[PDB]
Design a protein around this ligand. Structure first.
Ligand code: NI
Length: 341
């Protein structure tokens, strides 16, 4: 059965609620982004209206074969009317096509659902600045003070400098980057750009990336592995056995692998700066775990909420345990008392 935190009161709407069958009294199903814990349940047999971004709609049509007549893409930053309710989609700074949703209820309540997001001060100058929000459905993935991480910019600088140095030292080194969903494309694209290479990948991943509207993508990605020195592989193959085997497949073109695993957080962050990160090495294979997050850190999330001053917060992540819930509720109270709302 659908949980309460996926239902928008006073509407016929749900959010990211496709794995529960036909939800009672749902007239429109919203999808914030194309990640499997959120889209799980969609297919060519789905015949209810789905509301989403243009990019998410490309992925629905091409990857899951949802029929076009049921896909309702909305432009960002634009007031739209859905089943008589005004809505706006805003950029969530998560993966490509990821949105937050503002709902303007007929009785005057204003609700923001963040979907998955990485809070940023740039958001303080969208259509959010223009009115009060009464309820916030918040991505609380990293809602605990131990979750610090560097900016995306610092992490990309580290990866580019590391890859550029390694391949300059050894022109026969291969760089490999792990992936298992859309998101974090900047990792492999920035590395390929500094090395003057395209990124080689499977036909299926290349198809997924072509759905995204990324400018000059035919310019950075390819299915011809032979001509590329940056390869993308499934995250599951990013280990010593998987990479030894891949290296065998390249036919003596290469004699070393430098691999990257962009993780969310890892407890090395509590003791280590980005400058100080080192790889795991075995033989002629090195693996770097890099803290590239597409969710808010604790401090980024705190700042966003203290700026927005919602009257009620409803968490959407880590809700399954009483200890997690109570912990998060305590932080929300602190934030409110410290900010004065
Ligand atoms: Ni996500």
């Amino acid at each position: 059965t659908c949980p309460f935190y996926k239902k928008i009161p006073g509407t016929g709407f749900t959010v990211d609620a496709f794995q529960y069958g036909v939800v009672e009294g749902c007239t429109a199903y919203f999808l914030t982004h194309f990640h499997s814990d959120h889209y799980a349940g969609l297919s060519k047999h789905f015949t209810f209206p789905v509301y989403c971004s243009e990019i998410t709609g490309n992925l629905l049509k091409n990857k899951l074969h949802v029929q076009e007549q049921y896909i309702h893409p909305l432009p960002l930053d634009t007031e739209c009317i859905v089943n008589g309710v005004k809505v706006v989609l805003l950029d969530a700074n998560h993966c490509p096509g990821a949105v937050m949703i503002l709902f303007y209820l007929p009785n005057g309540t204003v609700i923001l659902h963040t979907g998955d997001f990485r809070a940023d001060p740039s958001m303080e100058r969208s259509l959010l600045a223009d009115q009060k929000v009464h309820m916030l459905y918040l991505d609380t993935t990293y809602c605990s003070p131990e979750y610090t991480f560097p900016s995306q910019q610092e992490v990309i600088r580290f990866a580019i400098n590391t890859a550029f140095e390694a391949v300059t030292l050894n022109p026969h080194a291969l760089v490999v980057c792990g992936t298992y969903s859309i998101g974090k494309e900047k990792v492999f694209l920035a590395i390929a750009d500094v090395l003057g290479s395209k990124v080689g990948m499977s036909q299926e991943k290349y198809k997924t990336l072509q759905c995204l509207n990324i400018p000059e993508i035919n310019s950075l990605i390819t299915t011809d592995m032979c001509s590329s020195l940056v390869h993308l592989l499934p995250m599951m193959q990013i280990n010593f056995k998987g990479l030894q085997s891949h290296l065998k497949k390249c036919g003596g073109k290469y004699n070393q692998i430098l691999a990257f695993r962009p993780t969310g957080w890892t407890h090395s962050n509590k003791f280590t700066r980005i400058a100080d990160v080192i790889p795991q090495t075995k033989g002629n294979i090195s693996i770097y775990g890099i803290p590239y997050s597409e969710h808010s850190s604790y401090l980024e999330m705190k700042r966003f909420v203290q700026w927005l001053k919602p009257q009620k917060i409803i968490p959407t992540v880590n809700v399954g345990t009483w200890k997690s819930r109570s912990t998060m509720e305590k932080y929300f109270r602190e934030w409110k008392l410290e900010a004065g709302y």
